[PDB]
Subunit: 121 residues, 4 copies
């Protein structure tokens, strides 16, 4: 639960359930204008991913949360439209914050929103 700075929440709109065991890769745009592996995980039984980074580690930058939606759907036996879902944003530019990226998935569609709260600094 909020304490970490980057939390991801994935729901399944076909089943009306959390999207479980969904793979998520996080990237930081390097100095060279290339994406650099930052963190990864799988969502739990509640479709959340926590413990990705820490505050000292999560500096300002452009990150990409890539969610592997193709894999989750294939595995439930659907051939979905998308390759994956990718969310690109600028984090911590006017100070550190807490970020929640939620993705609501369906086979030919996905919505996605962000909740940003001010820790304090």
């Amino acid at each position: 639960e909020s304490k970490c700075p980057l939390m991801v929440k994935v729901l399944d709109a076909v089943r009306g359930s959390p999207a479980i065991n969904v793979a998520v890769h996080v990237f930081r745009k390097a100095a060279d204008d290339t994406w650099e592996p930052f963190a990864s995980g799988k969502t739990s039984e509640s479709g959340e991913l926590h413990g990705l980074t820490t505050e000292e580690e999560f500096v300002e930058g452009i990150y990409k949360v890539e969610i592997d939606t193709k894999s989750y759907w294939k595995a439930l036996g659907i051939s979905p439209f998308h390759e994956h879902a990718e969310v690109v944003f600028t984090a911590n530019d006017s100070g550190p914050r807490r970020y929640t990226i939620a993705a609501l998935l369906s086979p030919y569609s996905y919505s996605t929103t962000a909740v940003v709260t001010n820790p304090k600094e």
Copy 2:
């Protein structure tokens, strides 16, 4: 062919198609403050309904468009969450020209958006 100040567009998020043959019933709130039938139809092959009304019969007021989402997934043999999808809006043409009411459906969710324009 006849001013369509009101249009509905329904789409299927599972299959990536228009949702066709969806029952849409529209209602005008009456002073007695109940709903009164107003226009009805089934979405075409492109998941659209048109010729619902005309600009003379469409006066300001509270309208409710109701989509029979449940029969839609049933026919597909997929178990739905909702009984139907509903949109309640105030039509205030003191500006507003055309109204497109779109809904994206999934077994457990639905989005809806309005496209209100002039041309």
Copy 3:
């Protein structure tokens, strides 16, 4: 947090924040085919509503969660398109369950999903 059977979560897509102090009215379709007041609330600072009903009270039926979106937007100074958001579903027909109705709001749009988990019975 899950323990109650009907929980509502409302997010603001314009601000990227929980939709706070949002009024929610819950109805049960009577025997007579009329909606009967069932419960009401306001969402908290985290855009959730809990403690609406109890398990013994929430029998099978058709309920309507009506969210007063017009009021929240007006108050932030927008004239939104919708009158309110209303969610109609059949609850507890093949046994009791836990229901989470989330609504993601914008001025001319709203998405909404349901998470249903099996308590046990």
Copy 4:
């Protein structure tokens, strides 16, 4: 006027309008496995982009459509969450005829859906 096997539709959820003058850059994944520019344009007045390609140039493959969402809200002086919206899909016409890629935007969220059809 020319087969448009690919179409993008952008809409604004704050204002209830098409999103016009949105930059859309499409890309074809190359074996070198990088993206290669493929088609580009700005949405019209109805928030649509067409004449992106033709059925001969559109072969199976991994495509990415990228929407410059951020400049869009900027021009409106509303602070955005995302740098842009992206859709990666495999175009496998061994069936598929037309592709409509729609995106509904808000300052902190976006939905996207695909409408894949035959007619």
